[PDB]
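Consider this pair:
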Amino acid sequence: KTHVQLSLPVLQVRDVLVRGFGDSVEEVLSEARQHLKDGTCGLVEVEKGVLPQLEQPYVFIKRSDAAPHGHVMVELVAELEGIQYGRSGETLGVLVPHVGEIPVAYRKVLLRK
């Protein structure tokens, strides 16, 4: 399928144990996509002081449309030293590996895969 219904666990930035997906824009987008497929991907909601606590390059999920079965359609945009790779809508959060942190909520998304 071109789209996949996911429920992403929302993690507090101070709980996150693995604070990014790797060391290049291509690697983090690759890794984010694999973890999203494997159900091992968390979401951190972006606010003042969150991004400096995570590792660049960043992977964002961004709203791609204005929401089937409650799932907001999203796509991936990466960011390194203030340059973004991809063009999309509003940020829903920054993706990180999920290694068993307890979530505060779930974000239902329909991921363009």
About this structure: Residues 3-112 form a domain with the SH3 type barrels. fold (CATH 2.30.30). Strands lie at 3-10, 41-44, 58-63, 72-80, 83-85, 91-97, 105-112.
